[PDB]
Design a protein around this ligand. Structure first.
Ligand SMILES: [Cl-]
Ligand SMILES: [Cl-]
Ligand SMILES: [Cl-]
Ligand SMILES: [Mg+2]
Ligand SMILES: [Mg+2]
Ligand SMILES: [Mg+2]
Ligand SMILES: [Zn+2]
Ligand SMILES: [Zn+2]
Ligand SMILES: [Zn+2]
Lengths: 591, 597, 590
């Protein structure tokens, strides 16, 4: 039966294809090998257990060597592969990171688009993924990107929902929460941060970077602005401060100034996250290090560059022998990279067509993790040939909103506006016109659903968009009614005809429909996450042999022997051998 | 009749495909043609070319040194597509953009646009004349230095040439429009650079003598290439007459911390200006470039965004953006840089057949040290031999081979030797120990034997004795400069040879071509006779011909524009011929070509 | 069973690779109804000619045919019919199934021609089935009708002449196997070469029907060699030799209506014996000669069921009967049952699309070449083989030219192949009868081993051909009598078991062909039990088949899936046999 359920998924996929793969490129027909005895060395995880989050923050500050966060298991594939990287490929390498690179600060491996996408697109539980990484790497900190008032979603939630979620995340194994607000609005962060401290985990409050601190003609976003935000987040009870350069806009000179000034403004350690879209982010990371930054993010070489993080192996190599040398073995970095390379090939279906660095990022400000996405939508809305006008629209739409931080979800809101401008052939001057008579997302933002910029929203655009609906300027969750968690849990148990887990109730609070659809498919198809990635996406070619582990003990030998023509009722029969026993699995012909 | 030959080319490719493109990915069927950007319309401003002519090469070098701003060289027209598109970039696309560079970016130091692999690949794979290319660039950008890579003892070839031949080619190159010669020897052997350096100066042109970078000056476990190895060479090259010293970091090995130290030291060891070339394979070469700039380097190379990154140069627009407003701000408009880059992106889309499968940065570069321009090629060569799933063993054997040869500068042509050694080691399952084993017969590759014999010159500490003795199978090696053993070419006699083969007089340029590439040039000349001036065709037509019904505009001369329509194509006849039915300017033309399937 | 296993192996081997005889030929309409055996009226079978022959014996039975007023009928559908139209590929499955229906619906029939000729050879070599088994099955289906074979005389059932004791031995077996009526012919109308066979048929107490092969034209004075006296002498001659019945074997369909009125008056006046007439309808007028024969008082005639009649076959049974219906010689055969059986043969025919010729209809050309109905199409594909399709009418002129060269001879198996081989070559090399007078194996072998023509062979032609002394003695006398006890041990040592008497007869006739068949029997089992589509095309994907492995055991075989070709060359067919999953590996021969 465990086996039966899987065999049926392997029949369906073999006969019909995966919807996400069926007409995108296929992988080069001509497998990843986990690298090849000791126990594991205590690391940052044992240290955090010893010191607690406050003192641990202090230990980072005092530490001479730069500390490294590896973003491969989250941001890396979120930016390069539409976030389609699977638990199977992520879980299998954790033990290797654990044994081979025990000096790492943390693995960024959760939150961001992974929660959503893992269920909705990859038919797998994100809590299962977290647990398996926890078991693989008991000596490293596990880091998530947490979207402040948004959790792992796009709408701002009731306070208790946010509270509940952070509680279960901590229980699932998150040690380090990188929390951010899409308008750098500290008031909208106080709920999540307090929730993190109350779990006794690391609250790394982030400041999103935009504009250019060294351009006097763009004064909205200068030095003071960042340094004051820092001082505000310390008072707010942060253990660490992050600079989140979501679009890779921080230039090297700017880093040199920024990180001096930040460390003078606060005693807290500083953590720097950036993207390589410009093709010089590594210069900025090195600059940051030279100015004394406490911790930096990079991605394994094979999933680095462009819209991802800059190259981990190269940055480490740049520092090796220096006062701030991180002490990571370059030969082990390569071995793990060669693995991710072999992993990456399996996702040929999800490669963008981005060929290299673009200094154009300084014009549009699209976040690394939005870039490809917004090119896909433009191709979808038929605008492929006009893509550069869309970049111009983004920036123009950005000025219109009064020059704002564009990170999730405010970035979609700008995206949505820019596409409408190019489509409906509209200028900003038309957009503002009091007479030239808006995406749901835009109206949402302009009322006050995602908070307030420093500016305040431009009054003329606002009164035009809202047309009737008076705006609110209070903090969103201070209007949302406190979800009846008791009463909202029943609804998902009479819809699934069973008790769920606290973790499951969490997935549901965040994504009612996506979790629902996931639970049904899961009762149909079984533990599909244990299937290797080429089997998950393409089934089993004829005569072929597959090993899957359904639990701790049992390994299954699954062989596709044969696949019949289609019968009278529209069915197709796949003939299997499961551990030497003959199996026939009928699967409906969806052609 | 030049129309007839062009139609014959179009028919052949229409019916049979182009051998270089037939079995590779095709461009998107949509495909916006590249649009030359509209320019404001103000004149061309005097730039570095006028200054060179005024000052002569020596004082101009001085001018570079004294300039506070950092000087940029754009590599897009040469190293850019050598590294990323197998050098297949065509004259049509290269020359169409020169005027834009000229009007828009007048402050550039030079366009690197000639030499390296372009000389050979233009004739061999593109059926076009590298001198014609240079002439069109010269005419479009009369205010900028035109720059070439010149291989010192190998000219634009791969083998050693007689002195008089190296001297002759350099004279033609100067005449053809080259202003700035980056000249390098693959073993950093100054003795072997002297003839070239002297020839460049005798032409009153810029001699930018290069030091190749390898290893790590900051790693005291690798002392052979320490700081003083570079500063000694810079002093030696100056004595030898350089106007400019280049650091040629062919594999992108130089790290930022090392650049801080190297460029400060160089500019103290010599008064000449310094020019820094690197490659972005590591994914951090821009950090090294900005650090070089911080440290006072005079010029740096970059490639236009759309042809930069990975094995190419680091991104030009972003480098420029990061200097914007600094003390050494290079004075280049990034709007215009982005416009020229957008053109290059459309141009590059046409070359889908030649894209590699490289995904991004690789710190593995610090291990293998493969030059950026070799990487993709070597990997194709490995695939060729069934070694695709063992690429990383090839990269490891390449490192091991480097050490076995005594740890050497790896760049054309010495890099190809190490590559040959590596491929053989992986195929035949041989460790370095096996390679030098007394009990193991090993047929060494020809490039390896030749190198240990002396043909490529002398590394600073000689060739490892036991390896050499084993590889040479009794042949006696030499330590003189390989050119001093070559017979002076009988220039008069040889010119007569090619003139009798082609039954016509050739120009001096054509003759230099022949001197460097006798077979490839002859072949090219025979193709020109049959097909006419195919370089005037747009790139899709050149690689794919015309689809059924398709209308193409083409300029056979500056005078007229031919309108060509593919009206119909016949079945293969009993002669094995296919008839293409063209309209040329409303008139019917039936062209017959062979069915080559 | 392992017999079941063997059938699956075959079914898999044909499903994956096709039948070699069918794979590159036309395929039955994808529509196609299963032929349906008609439910015949009642319970028992009316005694018929079989019971009469049991009671009376052969001589007296001959007298009874003579005396009978009604015309008697032989149905040739089971033998000559598909030999002429379908290259003798008709299967036992289809033949056996209909026997009982004949037995109930047409008890008045004289005989079923159903054995002999090319069937013996072709059933084994091309159909992978036992001709004796086939005979037994018809015997069981029709215990009231006579069963008739064609016997090539001294050639027996092969193409060469055999030892006397082999001919004797084979005929003994044919009797024990169920044949009641033997039609014996010599390919040169040579009675001395017939004497052994007839004696042997008499000795086994079955009907000796001694045939006289018709050729030329008794009514054309310009061709006197085969005049009326020629035949009437041969009729009187064979009566001395002990015929129970005299046949006129018109192998080429050359006898014309006016010639029939004369020939049959004269014959019945020459001999007391009944006369049986066999013809072929290549002219498109043979029915006319049949009806002329009846009116002149012939005792028995041959016809083929409507659906396998006309052209190179026999003339139409149903139409001949309908024409005699109500006349004083009315054969007493239900026209509606003939049509029911015809509808059946029509559905059976459609299954053999692979073997249809492109013969369009009647050809008066037959009077020029004289090619036997059974040869015509054969020799035309053969001419095709050698790129002569375009010069086919020249190949016909060549055959008639060749015939005159040999001296205007009786052309029929195996003398006909001999003229065939000659004319083919003659065209290939562009050679006149003047040129001819380096040969094919069989042209020199006849001039030496087929027997003697009434005048002898042409002098110069025999000399320039044989290049070695010729003989005139009966071939069966110069062939030392085969050691029968020795020869048996040989086929039994090779086949690692003793064979039955019938099987030793097969081996004696066709040593190589029987040997290969036995081996195939051991490998594929009783394939003859499969229905015809299955035997030639296997089972479609998901097709359900019902097959009778034996008596009252039906197997339910379903082909459920067919795997890709595996690394070690094999292919795996996934059967369900009687609800039980089964896996059969066969090699991809392609
Ligand atoms: Cl949902
Ligand atoms: Cl050459
Ligand atoms: Cl035989
Ligand atoms: Mg620190
Ligand atoms: Mg300077
Ligand atoms: Mg009668
Ligand atoms: Zn990010
Ligand atoms: Zn280079
Ligand atoms: Zn017949």
């Amino acid at each position: 039966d465990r086996a039966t359920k899987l065999l049926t998924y392997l029949a369906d996929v073999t006969v019909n294809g995966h919807p996400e793969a069926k007409d995108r490129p296929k992988p080069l027909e001509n497998r990843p090998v986990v690298p090849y005895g000791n126990g594991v060395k205590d690391g940052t995880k044992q240290l955090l257990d010893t010191l607690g989050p406050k003192k641990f923050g202090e230990w980072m500050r005092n530490e001479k060597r730069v500390l490294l966060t590896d973003t491969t298991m989250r941001d890396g594939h979120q930016s390069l592969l539409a976030t389609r990287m699977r638990t199977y490929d992520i879980a299998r390498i954790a033990g290797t990171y654990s044994h081979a690179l025990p000096n790492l600060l943390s693995l960024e491996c959760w939150g961001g688009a992974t929660f959503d996408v893992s269920m909705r697109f990859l038919t797998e539980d994100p809590w299962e993924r977290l647990a398996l990484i926890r078991e693989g790497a008991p000596n490293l900190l596990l880091q998530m990107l947490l979207r402040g008032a948004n959790g792992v979603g796009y709408t701002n939630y009731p306070d208790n929902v946010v509270k509940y979620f952070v509680r279960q995340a901590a229980k699932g194994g998150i040690d380090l929460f990188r929390v951010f607000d899409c308008l750098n609005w500290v008031e909208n962060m106080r709920v999540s941060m307090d929730a993190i401290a109350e779990e006794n985990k690391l609250c790394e409050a982030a400041i999103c970077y935009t504009g250019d601190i060294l351009n006097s003609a763009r004064p909205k976003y200068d030095l003071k602005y960042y340094t004051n935000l820092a001082v505000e987040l310390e008072k707010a009870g942060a253990h660490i401060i992050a600079v989140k350069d979501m679009a890779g806009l921080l230039k090297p000179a700017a880093a040199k100034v920024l990180f001096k000034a930040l460390r003078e403004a606060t005693g807290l350690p500083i953590h720097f996250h950036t993207h390589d879209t410009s093709g010089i982010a590594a210069a900025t990371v090195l600059a940051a290090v030279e100015a004394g930054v406490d911790a930096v993010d990079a991605a394994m070489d094979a999933l680095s560059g462009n819209t991802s993080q800059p190259c981990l192996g190269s940055i480490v190599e740049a520092l090796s022998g220096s006062e701030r040398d991180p002490g990571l073995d370059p030969a082990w970095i390569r071995r793990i990279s060669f693995y991710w390379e072999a992993v990456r090939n399996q996702y040929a279906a999800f490669e963008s067509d981005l060929k290299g660095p673009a200094s154009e990022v300084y014009l549009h400000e699209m976040p690394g993790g939005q870039f490809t996405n917004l090119k896909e939508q433009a191709r979808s809305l038929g605008l492929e040939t006009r893509w550069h006008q869309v970049a111009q629209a983004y920036a123009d739409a950005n000025q219109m909103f009064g020059d704002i931080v564009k990170v999730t979800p405010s970035s979609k809101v700008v995206g949505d506006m820019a596409l409408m401008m190019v489509s409906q052939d509209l200028t900003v001057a038309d957009v503002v016109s009091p007479d030239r008579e808006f995406p749901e997302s835009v109206v949402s933002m302009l009322k006050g659903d995602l908070g307030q910029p420093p500016s305040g929203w431009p009054e003329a655009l606002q009164k035009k968009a809202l047309k009737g609906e008076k705006p609110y300027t209070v903090r969103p969750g201070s209007l949302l009614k406190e979800a009846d968690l008791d009463a909202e849990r029943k609804v998902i148990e009479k819809k699934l005809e069973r008790e769920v887990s606290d973790f499951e109730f969490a997935s549901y609070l965040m994504y009612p429909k996506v979790f629902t659809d996931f639970a049904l498919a899961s009762d149909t198809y079984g533990p599909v996450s244990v299937l290797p990635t080429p089997a998950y996406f393409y089934g089993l070619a004829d005569g072929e042999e597959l090993f899957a582990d359904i639990e701790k003990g049992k390994t299954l030998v699954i062989v596709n022997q044969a696949v019949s023509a289609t019968d009278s009722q529209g069915m197709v029969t796949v003939f299997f051998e499961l551990n030497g026993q003959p199996r026939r699995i009928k699967v409906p012909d969806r052609a």
